[PDB]
Every structure is written in C-alpha cells, then in structure tokens.
C-alpha cells in the first residue's frame, strides 16, 4: 500500500503528450493507491471554473474515475491554478486542501504544500502572489466576462515571461530558513512540495531532530511522483507511456 504525490504537470492544450501521460497514470498507477495528492500546478493556467475549456472536463472526468474507483484525490493550489474552485472540485471529485496541510501517513507526520511560499527571496513574485491571492481582487477578476479574463491572463503571462527573463536563479529557489520555520510550525520531520521543478531529497534539522524535504519534479519529458509507504519514501521517475534491434 502507498500514497501518491504529484505536482507541476502544467497541463495545457498545446501539450497533448503530457495530457496522455497523465491519463495513462490515472488509469493505471493511480488506481492502486490509498490516496492521490496533487500539490499544485495541475494546469498551466486557470481563469475560473466556468471556463468551457474541454481539457478541463476531460481531466475532471479522468480524476472522477479514479475517485469512483475508491482512490480519494486531494488538491492544493499552485501558483498557476490558484483559481481552481469548488465547482471543478465537484466535477472531478477532488477535495481541495489549504496552502499547507499536515498528514498522518502511516505514522509519520508529513507537511504538504506547493512550495512557492518557500521562495521568500523573490520579492517580485511575492508581491504578485499577494495581489492575485487577495480575495476582493479575485472576485473582481472572476466577475468579468470570460473573454475579458482570457485577454487579461494572456497579457499577464506575456508580461511575466519578459519580466522573469531578467531574474537570477539565486533568489528564485527555496529559502532554507523558511523550510525550518514551516517544518517547526507544524512539528514535522517530513515535507513534500513541488514548484521548483528540482526533484530531490534534502536533509536538514528541525525540532532538534533530522528532517527531510522531498521535492517533486515537473512533468516535462517524463513523469514524476513521490510514493509514501509504511516502510519508505520514494521519489520516482517514469515515462508517460519495448522493441529490439
């Protein structure tokens, strides 16, 4: 038995190969887990649950089949899809969780999050995140016509793509002090997150004991997942979908 953790799939229409790899994962590996946690950035973009984007319903139906197969699915918002709301949760059967959750996984206490709130050195993103996460700014954006939200989101992506082109990767990683503060705020020796796209297992010190930070990988050329069993924690890389010469 095991619990699965995925994040940073960045599903979008222009990347059907990633979509097909995620659909195969939901039909096979996901059906065998006690639970499936999606730690943010499931979608490359999200402007509201009323978006009739067909990929949204194709993904919701596939996740609903996993939930119907007896595997509960949970979602934590990422920096790309923080607008995923209760309507999509019902369409997909997923349970939406807070920005930080503490799980009892077979005895070990694990803190789960997306990981973007750990990059406290990036003042540019932190200001952008505080703005787009303010409730009244959200409900104003969501009240606009959908085609207006599309033009807003398209320009903001082009704006941030040209602004991030002049940023150093030293202020864009995880802050080590923020990890210890989070792992001691929740009193855990285990932390799983994504966002940074650097799959790794980092050892640190928290609560006077050794602690570990498990980072998920983004779904680029191949898939990535964290598998937590009663015996071990596994960081797994696998292809989306054999011959001889």
Q: Which residues are annotated as a binding site?
A: 8, 10, 41, 79-80, 114, 122, 160, 164, 167, 195, 197
**How far is 145 from 34, CA to CA, in rounded Å?**
40
SS3 call for 31: helix
Q: Does 41 bind Mn ion (CB under 5 A)?
A: yes
Of 11 and 103, nearer to ligand OKV (C-beta) is: 11
Q: Does 81 bind Mn ion (CB under 5 A)?
A: no
Helix (H) or strand (E) holding 179: helix 176-185
One residue of 160, 205, 207, 229 binding ligand OKV per CB under 6 A: 160
Least distance CB 140 / ligand OKV (angstroms): 6
Enumerate the H helices of 16-167 as residue ranges: 16-27, 54-68, 86-92, 123-132, 135-143, 146-163
Of 24 and 197, nearer to Mn ion (C-beta) is: 197
Task: Give which of 34, 39, 15 is closest to 116, Cα–Cα.
Answer: 39
Task: Give which of 119, 115, 125 is closest to 226, Cα–Cα.
Answer: 115
Residue 221 interacts with which of ligand OKV, Mn ion, none, CB < 5 to 8 Å by class: none
Q: Does 77 bind Mn ion (CB under 5 A)?
A: no
Residue 41 interacts with which of ligand OKV, Mn ion, none, CB < 5 to 8 Å by class: Mn ion
Least distance CB 42 / Mn ion (angstroms): 9
Contact at 8 Å (CB) between 46 and 80?
Answer: yes
Q: Does 128 bind ligand OKV (CB under 6 A)?
A: yes
DSSP 44: S
Q: Does 219 bind ligand OKV (CB under 6 A)?
A: no
Residue 132 interacts with which of ligand OKV, Mn ion, none, CB < 5 to 8 Å by class: ligand OKV
Q: Does 74 bind ligand OKV (CB under 6 A)?
A: no
Residue with tokens 């990929």: 55
**How far is 207 from 149, CA to CA, in rounded Å?**
45
Of 50 and 159, nearer to Mn ion (C-beta) is: 159
Q: Does 138 bind ligand OKV (CB under 6 A)?
A: yes
Q: 12-46: b or e for each residue (b if 16 or more CB lie within 10 Å)? A: eeebeebbebbbbbbeebbeebebbbbbbbbbbbb
Of 146 and 156, nearer to ligand OKV (C-beta) is: 156
Query: Where on the chain is the footprint of ligand OKV (CB under 6 A)?
Result: 45-47, 79-80, 83, 125, 128, 132, 137-138, 141, 152-153, 156-157, 160
């Amino acid at each position: 038995v095991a619990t699965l953790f995925i994040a940073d799939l960045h599903l979008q229409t222009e990347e059907p190969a990633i979509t097909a790899g995620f659909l195969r994962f939901l039909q096979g590996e996901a059906r065998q887990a006690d639970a499936l946690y999606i730690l943010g950035d499931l979608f490359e973009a999200w402007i509201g649950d009323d978006d009739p984007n067909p990929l949204h319903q194709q993904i919701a139906s596939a996740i609903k089949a996993v939930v119907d197969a007896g595997v509960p699915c949970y979602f934590i918002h990422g920096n790309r899809d923080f607008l995923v709301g209760q309507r999509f949760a019902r369409q997909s059967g997923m349970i939406l969780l807070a920005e930080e959750e503490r799980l009892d996984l077979y005895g070990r206490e694990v803190l789960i999050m997306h990981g973007d709130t750990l990059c406290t050195d990036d003042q540019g993103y932190l200001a952008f995140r505080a703005k787009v996460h303010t409730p009244w700014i959200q409900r104003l954006f969501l009240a606009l016509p959908l085609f207006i939200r599309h033009r807003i989101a398209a320009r903001m992506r082009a704006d941030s793509k040209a602004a991030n082109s002049s940023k150093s990767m030293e202020i864009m990683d995880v802050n080590p002090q923020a990890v210890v503060d989070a792992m001691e705020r929740h009193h855990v020796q285990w932390l799983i997150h994504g966002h940074t796209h650097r799959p790794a297992v980092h050892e640190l010190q928290a609560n006077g004991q050794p602690a570990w930070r498990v980072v998920l990988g983004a779904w680029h050329s191949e898939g990535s997942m964290v598998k937590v069993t009663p015996d071990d924690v596994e960081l797994i890389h696998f292809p989306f979908l054999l011959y001889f010469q």
